[PDB]
Amino acid sequence: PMPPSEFLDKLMGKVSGYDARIRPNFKGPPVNVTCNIFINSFGSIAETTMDYRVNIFLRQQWNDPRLAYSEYPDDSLDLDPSMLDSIWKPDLFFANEKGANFHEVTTDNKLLRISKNGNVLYSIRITLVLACPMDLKNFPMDVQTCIMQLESFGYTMNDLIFEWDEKGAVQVADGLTLPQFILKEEKDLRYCTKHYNTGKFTCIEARFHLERQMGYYLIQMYIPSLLIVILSWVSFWINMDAAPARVGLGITTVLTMTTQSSGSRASLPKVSYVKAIDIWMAVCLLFVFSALLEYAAVNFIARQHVEEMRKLFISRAKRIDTVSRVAFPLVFLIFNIFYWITYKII
Amino acid sequence: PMPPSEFLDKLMGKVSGYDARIRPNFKGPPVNVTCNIFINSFGSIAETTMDYRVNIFLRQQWNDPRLAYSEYPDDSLDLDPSMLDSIWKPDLFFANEKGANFHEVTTDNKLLRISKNGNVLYSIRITLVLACPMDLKNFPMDVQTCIMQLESFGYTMNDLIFEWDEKGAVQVADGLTLPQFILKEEKDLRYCTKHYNTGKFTCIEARFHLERQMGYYLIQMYIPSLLIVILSWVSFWINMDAAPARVGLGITTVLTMTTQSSGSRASLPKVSYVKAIDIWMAVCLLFVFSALLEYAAVNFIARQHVEEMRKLFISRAKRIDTVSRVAFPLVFLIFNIFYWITYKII
Amino acid sequence: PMPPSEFLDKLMGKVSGYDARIRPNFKGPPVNVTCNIFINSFGSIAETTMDYRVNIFLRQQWNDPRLAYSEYPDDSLDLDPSMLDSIWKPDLFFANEKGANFHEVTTDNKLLRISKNGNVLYSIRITLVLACPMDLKNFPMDVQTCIMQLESFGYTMNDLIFEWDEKGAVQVADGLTLPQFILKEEKDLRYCTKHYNTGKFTCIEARFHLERQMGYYLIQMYIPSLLIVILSWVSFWINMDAAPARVGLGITTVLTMTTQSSGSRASLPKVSYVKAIDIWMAVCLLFVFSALLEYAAVNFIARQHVEEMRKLFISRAKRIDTVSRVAFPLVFLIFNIFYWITYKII
Amino acid sequence: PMPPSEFLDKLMGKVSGYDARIRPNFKGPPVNVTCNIFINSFGSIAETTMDYRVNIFLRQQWNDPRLAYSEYPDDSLDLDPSMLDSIWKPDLFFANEKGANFHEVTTDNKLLRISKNGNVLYSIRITLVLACPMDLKNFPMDVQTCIMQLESFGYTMNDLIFEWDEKGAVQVADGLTLPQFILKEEKDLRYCTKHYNTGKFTCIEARFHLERQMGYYLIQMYIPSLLIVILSWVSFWINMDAAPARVGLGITTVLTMTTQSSGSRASLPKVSYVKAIDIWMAVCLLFVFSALLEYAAVNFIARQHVEEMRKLFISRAKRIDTVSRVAFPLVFLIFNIFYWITYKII
Amino acid sequence: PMPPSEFLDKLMGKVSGYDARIRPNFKGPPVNVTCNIFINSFGSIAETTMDYRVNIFLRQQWNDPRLAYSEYPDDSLDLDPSMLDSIWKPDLFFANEKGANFHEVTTDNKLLRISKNGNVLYSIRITLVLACPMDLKNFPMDVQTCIMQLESFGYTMNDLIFEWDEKGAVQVADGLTLPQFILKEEKDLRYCTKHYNTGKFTCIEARFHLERQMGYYLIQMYIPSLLIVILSWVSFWINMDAAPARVGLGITTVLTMTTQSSGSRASLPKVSYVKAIDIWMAVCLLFVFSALLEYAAVNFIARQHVEEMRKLFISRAKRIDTVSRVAFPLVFLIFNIFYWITYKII
Numbered sequence A, B, C, D, E: 001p002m003p004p005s006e007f008l009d010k011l012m013g014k015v016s017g018y019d020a021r022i023r024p025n026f027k028g029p030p031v032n033v034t035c036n037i038f039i040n041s042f043g044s045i046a047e048t049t050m051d052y053r054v055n056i057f058l059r060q061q062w063n064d065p066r067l068a069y070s071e072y073p074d075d076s077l078d079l080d081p082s083m084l085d086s087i088w089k090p091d092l093f094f095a096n097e098k099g100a101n102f103h104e105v106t107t108d109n110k111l112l113r114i115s116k117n118g119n120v121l122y123s124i125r126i127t128l129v130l131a132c133p134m135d136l137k138n139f140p141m142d143v144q145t146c147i148m149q150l151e152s153f154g155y156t157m158n159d160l161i162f163e164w165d166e167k168g169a170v171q172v173a174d175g176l177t178l179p180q181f182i183l184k185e186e187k188d189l190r191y192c193t194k195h196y197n198t199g200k201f202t203c204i205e206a207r208f209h210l211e212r213q214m215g216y217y218l219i220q221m222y223i224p225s226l227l228i229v230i231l232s233w234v235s236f237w238i239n240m241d242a243a244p245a246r247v248g249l250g251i252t253t254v255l256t257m258t259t260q261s262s263g264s265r266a267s268l269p270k271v272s273y274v275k276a277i278d279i280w281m282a283v284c285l286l287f288v289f290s291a292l293l294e295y296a297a298v299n300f301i302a303r304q305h306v307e308e309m310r311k312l313f314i315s316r317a318k319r320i321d322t323v324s325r326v327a328f329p330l331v332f333l334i335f336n337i338f339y340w341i342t343y344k345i346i
């Protein structure tokens, strides 16, 4: 009945000439390895380091005609992963690893099954900390495109070709949510074929389009910088001519808008360009700074020093205080319309 | 008397046809592996990473009829863990590992004992850093449910089935306490059977219901944000008409309630939704901000500028100061009743 | 003369029936393993993680009658630690490891010597990051008791028994000092025998009584919270009736005592109960807050508005200012006596 | 047809006298190993640690005449990296590793091809955390030069010589961008030959010239320290003679320029010398401090206490306030020209 | 000509009786191992952890008479480090490792050469994170002495003796600089021979005298705490009798000197004793606090309430303001002389 302890060593061992150092179809057509991944965990997307951690099931399917059995009755043999040191495997790697490891808890998390014609399925669990460049030109409203690319290191294009399969080449887990982002359904699958001075090597890559949850930044950044603009408008109502508190209220609201502007970039990389949260915290810094500059313009005109004109001399300091009480909720309201339309039109 | 150095190699070695790459009951019924865990250490439950560290004793019991002896007199053989590289073991893994390791101090912390009928006990010590999604909709008063699920990676459902045992499938250590949480006694034990394009794989999981200790947040968050509301009520008593200090006291209590609101989310993930500590630090931000807005309403009416009405002109600024001295401990007291009943009814 | 290259293989190898998978006195009395440790390094006692790092020399002594030689003349054989993969070793582990490793620099840091009757000394260097629960009810004046327990994993009580030796079972290095603590000389040595559903396993443990150096917390916490109480007493002297500065000095000393109360718990776990540094930073928060509340009581009575009683109307606002100038250094002084006697009586 | 399973063992194995412990041309001319690197990833350039992480492809070419075949028809043999434990390899290392590792995901990321005359190409993937000393004398405008040097450890100069190849010895990836720096195109390639008391060892090194993106520091450091200088010039306009706000505005702008000066060195090493961001934050600290010192000079002269001279007695306090209103935008403007010309001339 | 593939196995292998588990001169005089180190990298000297990272070349020279060849013509054999698993090596370790590792990039970074008489040179590259206790009684002006000690673990004094060699036992790299310290040229070389209950073990150690660069603490700690003392002297000039700003300037300069005193101990261990930066930040805290206490003494005497004495009643409040304007730059100047002479005399 061909006991299965003998059939493993009959097709892999010293007999039948199977050498694990030699690729299938040697000096012939190249090996066509097709791939698809299953993302278990996604996230911890850091921005100071500009990386993200993923946890994938890397499945590889190729054809090895030396492993094609004929006498065993069934169509597949799910095997022990101690056999995987004795068959040929493609030398796939990631061009943006930045450190990666296997999982070896209670057994090496590996899979091997061989069909009758020689089709070999090889599934391993890999934890990757993949590197992606962050384009933060409009920071709370951006759509990041972080990629992962699967190259060959030892075999060139005329020996080993990587492909995606047409039957859903990237599967995602059922309840995979992200704390700061969402993962869009459309995932690009293009080629990234590298040329070196050694040769040309195969490469396939999958783009992931991440869109931010803006609802966090409306709680910490935008609205608590919109309250302090209202504190700069409290100073336009008290006593209408001169007070020490109207400097002191314009003293204090600059302390926040300097600290909160520095506090808005506490967990960010040191990019050279200006971003969306900067030109909100800078324009709202002006409307705080122009509120103190307006009262300084009032006190400089009120403390200027007639027979009839002394009633008009207060009307030179009161007409300024009734334009600045009305026009600043028009200049702030025309910037607030100009800001969000510019960043919702992307 | 059958010396025990020979009996180990007789039942495991090249004789008797025992191959460690082949599961018990090959091409028959699937292997029924029953499991239970012992939690030594629990905790370091982070929230920026949304993970928790556990230290378990993973016990696995199955039946291997090829390991069934008959000539040895005693009922069990506690063995050396150097034997464990020569028997069949189930390829259990955790679907939410996020890195895990064995313990190999002074000996591999492993256990093996074999009964007469072939019952195999296999206990190992694993340190896990398990991932669980945090549902922080009501943050200091939530009941988190962090799980751990035990899957098979190479054998499908028709070859290997995981079960929990009915005799207390999750044991907890005697003095296992947590700094921030409590671990409830009722632990759910349900199934999580996964379907892939490779096959269907067995899965069992245990829910752990964690309940927060609210006593920490009453010391740092709630009561020091309740003192500053009383500082906003100090400004309703001094001089009753006009003072520079009543702006300056309303100046300073906004500096705290802006910093303490940002300080209340210093060790939290950046979730999009609003949580329980936000709508306490925001409503208590209003009662600070309305206290400055009330005095601005007094000074705008007091500095307005008759023959008889000038005594009533102070009564237009005194009646406001005696409603705001009484009605604000009524609006704060009706929110304080509405807040805690909403979050104790869960 | 029996050259020593042959005597190593004669007593350990395939001859003489020595099997390293079998414990001494098989199916007889249990193996009595006696232990003692030498602490090289102690410390890095974190409190957010509630752990401490130790660096021990773990010495183990047992009797192996199969290793008893008779023809070699000398009393001991200090051997190569490449031999330690060929003898029997007890499977000791620590029940609170939280990650631990050996030291393998320039040689495996191991020791082995075998007496003539078969006594085996086995000394290894281990770095442990041990877990101990912190009882922080009186935080700067507490006496912690952090333990370490040495269990067996595969052998039950009827096969292997751990003991401490009577000749100083815990040795400490000569100049071992700690930055925050002191290590007391009396060290408890009791039993911790564990019961599972697998069996009963041996356990011995050693308590370490750590006592804090209070001199750091007097420099940062206690005295800089005693200066700000004196700043709240500066406001009781200036102008005696009414000033904007007496609110503004009571404005500012609340900003410190709110920040310093939050700053006093910057490197602490989030325990639910109240500790000793809280009820010093809370009572000294009241004496700052009651100083501002006292001047608010003065200005509310001074700005109240006779023919003769107007001189007594200032004496209603001056008698309050001379009781609050004297009685507050009596209430603060009666708490300061009540505080330190409560926490020196432990 | 000479099947390739036999040709691997024929030229590497026990036959033909190939010993992997013996260098080519033994007791002859030294082995000339030529090298070139490909940089995949560059960056995470820390400054507290003074290091940088790189991810290179280290290609090594030498001549091994014992590997020179003649019967195989083709010009090269791309081999399995399991062969690399059986050939001679140069013992290259980096003199400033500070920890480094290989990449072993899905296969050891190694390359081996052997030409007909014995030319061996050996490409491996290394992640390095290389140490470079930071010269921070002018911090936001400096040009760093961080090196990497490739030494030999066991073979001296008379046995093994490292060289760079003339055909572009340092290749850079296509879209390699940096968040804070730019990598200049000209890369130095010089020698670093070391002399010890063991011998003289070969060394080659490549300088990398890094130039900072100044655009980040113009957003956080320079401009928010230029707004506070304008706040110190607001105090020169209000009431011209005496006000409590002109001290209080000079009170508050020192609080920022002390905190922002300490905040400007939050992610910097503790170097002894003075840098460019210090003498900008110190001179702008003076122009804040001299603004408070100017008003203190006004109030000391205005509160001095004639018959005719009392109108000139205000002109002694008004002429100071109209020179300090004009000359301080001349002293700040002459420093601002003197600062940037000094640091653009490098 | 004695081909070198045979000569390696002739003197190391099964022939000639060479056993790598037996030390040279067995049951004779002890093995005299002489040592010297080369320091490639030094630094990252942390103080919260109280450790430092070094990167050494550990060279060991002993005599092995079984390795003494006679037929080979040359004087030395630089060998492959794959041979090092077959010779005897001393079991040197460091008594204060705190974790350490080898360097294994592109080859194990090891060295072996054997002279004709049996002299063996053995150089390896080690990265150590060594522990040294910090004596911080005078913190910015201290001279630390951090050591490293090289013990034996398995062989006692009668079997193995460590020595330093007289020809410069500690070499330092050419351009080894430190960011915070300087390394003095005189390095002590003394003995540290340990006694245990196992036996007496050899030990040699080298002291390293580190001296701080004081230039950093003059930029952040000393001078920005000397400017705030000048802000406390601004309040002695304005209006000479009574002002709300003279409390408010003494209000604000306490906010800095409380935060900067806590900010000066942000990267320090929690030592119990008082250090040099504390008694500078405490005495300069008094001169800020006495400036507010002086003006409180002025306003208490000025607001006291004659016919002739009312001009002398201001002279009781003006003579205090002209002694405190002159004597405080005498008390601060006599402390500043007393402080630096005490800490330059060491």
Ligand SMILES: *[C@@H]1O[C@H](CO)[C@@H](O[C@@H]2O[C@H](CO)[C@@H](O[C@@H]3O[C@H](CO)[C@@H](O)[C@H](O)[C@@H]3O)[C@H](O)[C@H]2NC(C)=O)[C@H](O)[C@H]1NC(C)=O
Residues within 6 Å of the ligand: A025, A029, A030, A031, A032
């Ligand atoms: C792996 O996949 C590649 C690409 O799908 C296969 O290469 C292709 O092989 C076919 C026949 O084997 C080639 O067709 C031939 O084209 C030539 C002109 O070049 C002409 O004489 C005929 O029309 C003939 O059909 C095809 O060109 C070739 N394509 C490429 C890009 O190389 C390869 O055979 C597959 N290997 C295995 C083992 O499945």
Ligand SMILES: *[C@@H]1O[C@H](CO)[C@@H](O[C@@H]2O[C@H](CO)[C@@H](O[C@@H]3O[C@H](CO)[C@@H](O)[C@H](O)[C@@H]3O)[C@H](O)[C@H]2NC(C)=O)[C@H](O)[C@H]1NC(C)=O
Residues within 6 Å of the ligand: B025, B029, B030, B031, B032
């Ligand atoms: C491992 O556990 C599973 C589940 O308990 C066992 O499978 C069960 O095996 C029994 C008999 O071996 C099956 O009963 C049979 O049912 C068929 C109809 O399907 C009918 O002819 C009879 O009523 C007969 O009793 C049962 O259906 C089957 N259940 C499942 C879900 O497969 C299995 O035998 C156990 N294996 C070992 C080695 O203990």
Ligand SMILES: *[C@@H]1O[C@H](CO)[C@@H](O[C@@H]2O[C@H](CO)[C@@H](O[C@@H]3O[C@H](CO)[C@@H](O)[C@H](O)[C@@H]3O)[C@H](O)[C@H]2NC(C)=O)[C@H](O)[C@H]1NC(C)=O
Residues within 6 Å of the ligand: C025, C029, C030, C031, C032
């Ligand atoms: C390891 O240590 C244990 C405990 O010291 C030893 O067990 C003890 O062995 C003695 C004699 O071997 C026992 O004494 C006997 O007691 C029985 C009654 O139980 C009675 O017939 C006699 O009085 C006799 O002396 C003793 O009970 C037993 N104690 C325990 C707790 O088991 C053991 O022998 C030691 N093993 C080795 C290899 O040194």
Ligand SMILES: *[C@@H]1O[C@H](CO)[C@@H](O[C@@H]2O[C@H](CO)[C@@H](O[C@@H]3O[C@H](CO)[C@@H](O)[C@H](O)[C@@H]3O)[C@H](O)[C@H]2NC(C)=O)[C@H](O)[C@H]1NC(C)=O
Residues within 6 Å of the ligand: D025, D029, D030, D031, D032
């Ligand atoms: C590896 O490269 C080095 C450097 O290019 C080669 O060393 C050089 O070898 C040549 C001939 O083998 C030497 O030329 C000879 O010079 C002597 C005087 O020293 C004189 O008799 C002749 O003019 C003769 O041409 C050359 O000096 C020597 N240079 C050095 C620096 O050693 C070496 O041969 C190369 N090895 C291999 C295996 O390719």
Ligand SMILES: *[C@@H]1O[C@H](CO)[C@@H](O[C@@H]2O[C@H](CO)[C@@H](O[C@@H]3O[C@H](CO)[C@@H](O)[C@H](O)[C@@H]3O)[C@H](O)[C@H]2NC(C)=O)[C@H](O)[C@H]1NC(C)=O
Residues within 6 Å of the ligand: E025, E029, E030, E031, E032
């Ligand atoms: C390793 O070094 C040690 C110390 O340098 C050597 O030990 C010394 O060996 C010499 C002769 O081998 C001893 O001198 C003898 O002293 C005895 C009195 O003890 C006396 O009979 C003679 O004066 C004779 O010269 C010396 O005492 C001894 N010193 C110590 C501290 O043991 C050892 O020989 C060296 N081993 C090797 C293999 O080089």
